[PDB]
Design a protein. Structure first.
Ligand SMILES: [Mg+2]
Ligand SMILES: [Mg+2]
Ligand SMILES: [Mg+2]
Ligand SMILES: [Mg+2]
Ligand SMILES: [Mg+2]
Ligand SMILES: [Mg+2]
Ligand SMILES: [Mg+2]
Ligand SMILES: [Mg+2]
Ligand SMILES: [Mg+2]
Ligand SMILES: [Mg+2]
Ligand SMILES: [Mg+2]
Ligand SMILES: [Mg+2]
Ligand SMILES: [Mg+2]
Ligand SMILES: [Mg+2]
Ligand SMILES: [Mg+2]
Ligand SMILES: [Mg+2]
Ligand SMILES: [Mg+2]
Ligand SMILES: [Mg+2]
Ligand SMILES: [Mg+2]
Ligand SMILES: [Mg+2]
Ligand SMILES: [Mg+2]
Ligand SMILES: [Mg+2]
Ligand SMILES: [Mg+2]
Ligand SMILES: [Mg+2]
Ligand SMILES: [Mg+2]
Ligand SMILES: [Mg+2]
Ligand SMILES: [Mg+2]
Ligand SMILES: [Mg+2]
Lengths: 139, 135, 131
RNA sequence: AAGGAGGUAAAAAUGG
RNA sequence: GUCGAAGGUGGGACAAAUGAUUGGGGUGAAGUCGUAACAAGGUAGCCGUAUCGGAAGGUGCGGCUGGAUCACCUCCUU
RNA sequence: CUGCAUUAGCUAGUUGGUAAGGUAACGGCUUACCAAGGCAACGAUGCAUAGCCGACCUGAGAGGGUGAUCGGCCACACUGGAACUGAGACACGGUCCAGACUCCUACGGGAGGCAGCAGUAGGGAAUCUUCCGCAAUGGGCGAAAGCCUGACGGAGCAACGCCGCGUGAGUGAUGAAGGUCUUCGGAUCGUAAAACUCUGUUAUUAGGGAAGAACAUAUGUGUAAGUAACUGUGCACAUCUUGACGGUACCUAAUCAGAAAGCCACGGCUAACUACGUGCCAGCAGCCGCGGUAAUACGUAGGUGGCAAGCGUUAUCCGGAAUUAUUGGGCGUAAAGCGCGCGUAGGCGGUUUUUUAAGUCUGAUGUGAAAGCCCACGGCUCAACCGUGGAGGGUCAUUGGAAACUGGAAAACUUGAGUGCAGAAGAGGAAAGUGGAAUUCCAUGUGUAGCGGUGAAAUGCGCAGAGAUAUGGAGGAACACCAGUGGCGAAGGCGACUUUCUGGUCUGUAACUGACGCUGAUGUGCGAAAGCGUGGGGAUCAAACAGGAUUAGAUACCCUGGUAGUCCACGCCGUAAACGAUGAGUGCUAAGUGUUAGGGGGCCCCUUAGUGCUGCAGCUAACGCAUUAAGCACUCCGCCUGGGGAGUACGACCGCAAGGUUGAAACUCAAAGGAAUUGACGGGGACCCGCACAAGCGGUGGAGCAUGUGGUUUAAUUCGAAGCAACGCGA
RNA sequence: UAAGGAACUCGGCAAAAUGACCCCGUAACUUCGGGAGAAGGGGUGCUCUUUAGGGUUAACGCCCAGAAGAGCCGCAGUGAAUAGGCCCAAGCGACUGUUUAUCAAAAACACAGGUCUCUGCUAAACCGUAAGGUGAUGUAUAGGGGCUGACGCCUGCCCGGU
């Protein structure tokens, strides 16, 4: 890892030398990916980086960023009571989770009647859902 | 003090510290050592890019980058302006000037230098954010 | 113990002037007497008497107050001290209060005022300021 | 009569 | 043949980097436990020292007033 | 002419002498011999960093920072050593050797050193052309023409800096369109624009076109030394010829306002305000801060402000910062007086007389290069710039003068400091001995069922006889009353009495010495309590600890026990809010009133040394201090420089240990602090009042019932009111 | 005993190496004694010349014993023999000692030190049926027994059971 800056500089110089060789960072996987015209092309470039630029590198299959989804619908409840110590906290929600049409993305609906959930906290509930979904639930 | 006391032990002035220590140091790779040299800016590579929460009473998601400088010192540099195109491994220029809200952020990333892009849609005080004249 | 008789004399004069005393008795010495004579000649004090008794003698100064009880001596400052002695050249002689005051000096030509030092073109040890 | 200094008793539940 | 750079061998000195692991320090958001200090802060507080206790701290000995206070006597000032 | 003591010892050819050798030269420069010298707290040695200066930046100055360009001096030429040649080198583009690195090779063997000018790669935020000419100045060689000269003279690039000039000027209300705001009238951009007139600095085109050039040489004469006389040589006057820059600067003529304005800021500091969007988000920010629907602080727009071919940001230095204070600050409570003595070096030192001239003062001479800064003048059209004079800059040196002060030498004095003589008080210290009160324990007589303790209790002790009471014994520890802003001591501290040894202080006197004094780094001692070691001792009290209580819990406060320890000897430790939070010495500056130990003159007056209170002048941020200064002054020491980190880490020294002394930094905050003011509050106080107690009459609490409330129940038992100030209350 | 040098092996077992004298020089740590012969180096024969000394003697003489220089010889000079291998770390036991005569020498025993306990003298403890003895011709700073085991810093809670 001490040669990562050398690796970046070598990649820049090699991209200037060779239009068809590309290097980019993938945000989701945090990996640096090199794209080329073929196995021979990438092998030659890897050896050239190792020797000419003195940065020994290892190459592998790029990681695939998977996702998660719910296959079944269900009404669920979440309650949190923390009155025991010092400041007391209370929260409660009833949410129906449904498998959305594939590719439609997350959809939050507010079927609150009678102000049982004050309108102030509904955006907070949506944000909490967004964060908890950003964090995986299965893998 | 008496004049004799001053003759024996002369007066001693307070020593002044820099607000941007990381800019005062260069690195010689051949000798593998540090050297004292004042630079107005230093190049670096963004080790991390993200957001930080300011200390109270302020509240925000302030954009910053952890940068390793050309002298191998790792610092936190604020990203000024609205919107930026910086990621890990981006090569950026860093100048002095801390962000009072952000505790460990003591430098700024220059806009419109090296990889960093100018602020999109900026029209007043453009030179401070590296935005070309729209005309 | 005592280390600066001239400073002691100046402080005696200052304290007596503050309390608005009329006379002031102190142990005598030649330098003190010359200082007192310069003060009289310049008009800061009224009279100087020497008592040639035993034990080095006594100086008896008589202070001078103007109309409205205003004090003629505004202030006295020791300049040269045992801990640090001050000398000046003839061309570097200082003016006290833009000339309204005197600097008592000690020179090869006797202890004189700054005006006389400048006139005779001599320097020396700046004993004191009086204004 | 009002202020300053030394010694010296007796009393005592708990939480705001 | 003398002198003699570089070199070799040896035990020490000093400096820097780095090291499984480890110690307290600072900062940080509504965290958890209690409430030590500020009123006599509900056991006056603090200082040095010793020891004990999750924690602040408690306790002992000597010291300080930078301590509130009802009755008493003893003096000093106007 | 530099930083560090968290570097105190260094030196053995080292220091001196003798002899020789060696060198341009003196010399431990080298060798042989003899000696043990030499340096160092006036900082040696070690470590770290550094080319030095003229100067440059900043500052009112004193000072602080810097050592580019240009000039001087030094040092070096891949690294290390050496010598050769030479007048000169231990030699950048020389030699030899060694070393690292690199290159060529036919594999036998060879070669190289850009910190010369360009340029390449690399490092970096960042710094230029592989250009022209020797025409000018300078250099080497040559008799000379001349050759060489990446010195140099030029050109090229870069807003990098400074300076100069542009991007137009006059008129122009008819306040045109259009933007922004609006109170929907208008305001503003704005004489700005449009339009008419004018100019060409600049720009394009076409012509003319410098200086920098002196020369050298060559050719003519004239003159001067020498010659027997020429050629020649020196000098003087004339003539041909010599330009990279460059057909550049500059000048002239014509054409066009036409090609030539951007940057930052507008909450306060700080010059400049409004509308929309956003809504603690996005974002701003040098500090204070701004942003959650009315944002002059975020983004845009109009307008405005400052500058302008530049404007902003970052970095670094000086200033503001008197915030290390010589100029020019402090230490009672803000940071700061060592816990206190004794005392070394050093710093400082009473009065008079004579002498010296080291400091001190004054005159002359030399020097402080040039450039630079400052003043003046002159030349570029101006200016920058260039040139020429002046002035400045030394703690400089040599020399001649003065003697007041400081310093040195000599001689006197008694005022400071000690001594003698006559007196005073004292819990000053050390060691032995005696004594009364009281606590605990042991034994015994009497005696019965509690004692003890607390807010209230319980643990515990006691029917085996406790507790109470009387007597005797054992032992340890402290000295009731006197006792007092009283005494003594440097501080810590010292309180029964007696004896021995011993320290200090105060009063009067004026024989005696004659300045012998003050302070005091380093050092050396004393130093409350706790604590450590060895050996004793052990009543009381009491950390730890056990039990009881309180409490939500109670590792406490309270109660019952209880070990170390508390006591003694000898060692150790060396710290405390070791405080007057106030260093020592000295003198001077209104007063009133106590008290301790004295003295003098008539209960009074005066007086010395302490110890208190009150209080002027003066001081102080204020509180307050005020002859026992925190006033006015002089000498010396110690100490401080925002709050945390931290009295921590590392190093060192000390200690048996506990720990002590010395003592940072990274990082972090914009405060932390002092004195005083007004409120509020207190499980602070004093006083005053009230059917608040007290006095008294009658009630409620007990019974049945009425009613309201809580609870429960119900399909619902509608909702509201909850201490006084909810409950026959909204009703 | 070529080249190698622990590759052997459970293990460097055995062997090899070191070894004398003189000179230089010598670390952590430490209870300040030590560690230490630490380590790591240099010298060593013979001849001749010059030359400071000491003992014994009138002296000569005899004996001891250095220093400097210049030379000579070999592969090699404590020329043979005899004469430490060294170092860095960890466990255990403080140490010198003691032990299974004849398979165990150790970390086991002992130890100086610590502590508990008994014992007032015809002591307690011990031998003996007793007499008589040891303890001791000692007397609590003494004597017996148990446990611990130099030294440093320490040794907490439980007395219900035995
Ligand atoms: Mg409390
Ligand atoms: Mg309290
Ligand atoms: Mg306790
Ligand atoms: Mg250097
Ligand atoms: Mg200034
Ligand atoms: Mg050369
Ligand atoms: Mg070269
Ligand atoms: Mg070059
Ligand atoms: Mg680069
Ligand atoms: Mg200053
Ligand atoms: Mg303080
Ligand atoms: Mg003190
Ligand atoms: Mg000059
Ligand atoms: Mg004690
Ligand atoms: Mg107790
Ligand atoms: Mg202290
Ligand atoms: Mg103090
Ligand atoms: Mg008095
Ligand atoms: Mg073999
Ligand atoms: Mg062999
Ligand atoms: Mg093996
Ligand atoms: Mg094997
Ligand atoms: Mg063996
Ligand atoms: Mg053993
Ligand atoms: Mg056996
Ligand atoms: Mg055996
Ligand atoms: Mg054992
Ligand atoms: Mg035990």
């Amino acid at each position: 890892k001490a040669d990562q800056d050398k690796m970046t500089q070598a990649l820049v110089k090699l991209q200037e030398e060779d239009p068809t060789f590309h290097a980019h960072t993938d945000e989701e996987t945090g990996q640096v990916i090199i794209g080329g015209m073929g196995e021979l092309h990438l092998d030659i470039l890897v050896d050239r980086m190792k020797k000419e630029f003195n940065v020994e590198c290892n190459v592998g299959a790029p990681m695939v960023s998977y996702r998660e989804t719910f296959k079944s619908s269900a009404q669920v409840q979440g309650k949190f009571s923390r009155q025991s110590g010092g400041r007391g906290q209370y929260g409660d929600v009833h949410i129906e989770f449904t498998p959305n049409e594939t590719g439609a993305g997350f959809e939050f609906e507010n079927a609150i009647v009678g102000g049982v959930v004050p309108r102030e906290y509904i955006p907070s509930v949506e944000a909490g859902l967004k964060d908890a979904m950003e964090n995986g639930v299965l893998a | 003090p008496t004049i004799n006391q001053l003759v024996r032990k002369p007066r001693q002035s307070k020593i002044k510290k820099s607000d941007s220590p990381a800019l005062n140091k260069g690195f010689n790779s051949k000798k593998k050592k540090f050297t004292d040299l004042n630079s107005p800016q230093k190049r670096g590579v963004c080790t991390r890019v993200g957001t930080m929460t300011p200390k109270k009473p302020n509240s925000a998601l302030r954009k910053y980058a952890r940068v390793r400088l050309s002298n191998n010192i790792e610092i936190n540099a604020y990203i000024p302006g609205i919107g930026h195109n910086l990621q890990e491994h981006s090569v950026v220029l860093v100048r002095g000037g801390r962000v009072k809200d952000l505790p460990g952020v003591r430098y700024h990333i220059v806009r419109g230098a090296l990889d960093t892009s100018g602020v999109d849609g900026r029209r007043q005080g453009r030179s401070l954010y590296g935005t070309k004249k729209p005309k | 113990t005592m280390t600066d008789p001239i400073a002691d004399m100046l402080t005696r004069v200052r304290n007596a002037n503050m309390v608005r005393h009329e006379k002031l008795e102190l142990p005598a010495s030649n330098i003190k007497k010359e200082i007192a004579e310069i003060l009289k000649s310049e008009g800061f004090i009224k009279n100087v008497e020497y008592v040639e008794d035993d034990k080095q003698g006594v100086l008896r100064l008589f202070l001078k107050y103007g109309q409205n009880d205003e004090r003629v001596i505004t202030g006295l400052k020791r300049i040269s001290k045992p801990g640090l002695r001050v000398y000046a050249k003839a061309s570097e002689m200082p003016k006290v209060l833009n000339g309204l005051g005197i600097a008592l000096v000690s020179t090869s030509e006797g202890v004189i005022t700054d005006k006389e030092a400048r006139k005779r073109n001599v320097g020396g040890e700046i004993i004191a300021y009086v204004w």
